[PDB]
Curated annotation (Swiss-Prot), chain B:
Subcellular location: Cell membrane
Region Segment S9, annotated ranges: 4-24
Disorder association: Paroxysmal non-kinesigenic dyskinesia 3 with or without generalized epilepsy: An autosomal dominant neurologic disorder characterized by absence seizures, generalized tonic-clonic seizures, paroxysmal nonkinesigenic dyskinesia and involuntary dystonic or choreiform movements. Onset is usually in childhood. Patients may have seizures only, dyskinesia only, or both. Epilepsy, idiopathic generalized 16: An autosomal dominant form of idiopathic generalized epilepsy, a disorder characterized by recurring generalized seizures in the absence of detectable brain lesions and/or metabolic abnormalities. Generalized seizures arise diffusely and simultaneously from both hemispheres of the brain. Seizure types include juvenile myoclonic seizures, absence seizures, and generalized tonic-clonic seizures. EIG16 is characterized by onset of seizures soon after birth or in the first years of life.
PTM summary: Phosphorylated. Phosphorylation by kinases such as PKA and/or PKG. In smooth muscles, phosphorylation affects its activity.
Tissues with expression: Widely expressed. Except in myocytes, it is almost ubiquitously expressed.
Residues of the full protein shown: 834 to 952 of 1236
Domain-related comment: The S0 segment is essential for the modulation by the accessory beta subunits KCNMB1, KCNMB2, KCNMB3 and KCNMB4.
Family under the similarity heading: Belongs to the potassium channel family. Calcium-activated (TC 1.A.1.3) subfamily. KCa1.1/KCNMA1 sub-subfamily.
Domain named RCK N-terminal: residues: 6-119
Organism: Homo sapiens (Human)
Quaternary data: Homotetramer; which constitutes the calcium-activated potassium channel. Interacts with RAB11B. Interacts with beta subunits KCNMB1, KCNMB2, KCNMB3 and KCNMB4. Interacts with gamma subunits LRRC26, LRRC38, LRRC52 and LRRC55. Beta and gamma subunits are accessory, and modulate its activity.
Record function comment: Potassium channel activated by both membrane depolarization or increase in cytosolic Ca(2+) that mediates export of K(+). It is also activated by the concentration of cytosolic Mg(2+). Its activation dampens the excitatory events that elevate the cytosolic Ca(2+) concentration and/or depolarize the cell membrane. It therefore contributes to repolarization of the membrane potential.
Stated name of the protein: Calcium-activated potassium channel subunit alpha-1
Additional observations: The protein was initially thought to contain two functionally distinct parts: The core channel (from the N-terminus to the S9 segment) that mediates the channel activity, and the cytoplasmic tail (from the S9 segment to the C-terminus) that mediates the calcium sensing. The situation is however more complex, since the core channel also contains binding sites for Ca(2+) and Mg(2+).
Length: 110, 119
């Protein structure tokens, strides 16, 4: 419908807020979470990825689908590199480190 | 949009400031023949680039009912403003008579314009 409207006018037209549009507002968005100080802080210290996935889905209806992991995290020596790489859909028994980011789908709330 | 046009002629032109002239007077002269009464004359509205139409207006300013809507023939808003559903005829012309890498592709504009109006 928005495609047709843009095709008709070649512009984006404003409109007054109605309950139907406000209900249409509620969707899911792409986000990243840190395990340093969130509710999953204790679980991110050596816990498994599956427990995090289950807790996020059951509690906040959050869908975790990837780990953005610090590149120099498997090395014992400390490093100053802040680069991170992408791990898509890790298994249930995948281990977690506190310096990880979790891809997630947030639900809209007011 | 404020004025209401019914039983008129809409000439859509794919003009350009550097394209070759097509001599629009040869289209307006037969429609302004003296054997038609004044009330029988059909309003003519040119929809196209004003840069191209300024080069042609020198030979068109002596005719009674001619209007210009600066814009493009490929926009539904301009066609709705000119009441395309009540016109007697829509004439789609392509001024860009320049050579193209493929001969058939020279008709890429007009065909799409037609397929717009039918939809």
């Amino acid at each position: 419908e928005l495609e047709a409207l843009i095709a008709e006018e070649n512009a984006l037209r404003g409109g007054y807020s109605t309950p139907q549009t406000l209900a249409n507002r509620d969707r899911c968005r792409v986000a990243q979470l840190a395990l340093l100080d969130g509710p999953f802080a204790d679980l991110g210290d050596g816990g498994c990825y599956g427990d995090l996935f289950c807790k996020a889905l059951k509690t906040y209806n959050m869908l975790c689908f990837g780990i953005y992991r610090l590149r120099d995290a498997h090395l014992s020596t400390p490093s100053q590199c802040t680069k991170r790489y992408v791990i898509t859909n890790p298994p249930y028994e995948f281990e977690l480190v506190p310096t990880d980011l979790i891809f997630c789908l947030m639900q809209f709330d007011s | 949009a404020m004025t209401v046009l019914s039983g008129h002629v809409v000439v859509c032109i794919f003009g350009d400031v550097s394209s070759a002239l097509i001599g629009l007077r040869n289209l307006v002269m037969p429609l302004r023949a003296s054997n038609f009464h004044y009330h029988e004359l059909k309003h003519i509205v040119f929809v196209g680039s004003i840069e191209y139409l300024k080069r042609e207006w020198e030979t068109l300013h002596n005719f009674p009912k001619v209007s210009i809507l600066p814009g493009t023939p490929l926009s539904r808003a301009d066609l709705r403003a000119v009441n395309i559903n009540l016109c007697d005829m829509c004439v789609i012309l392509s001024a860009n008579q320049n050579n193209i890498d493929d001969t058939s592709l020279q008709d890429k504009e007009c065909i799409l314009a037609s397929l717009n109006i039918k939809s």
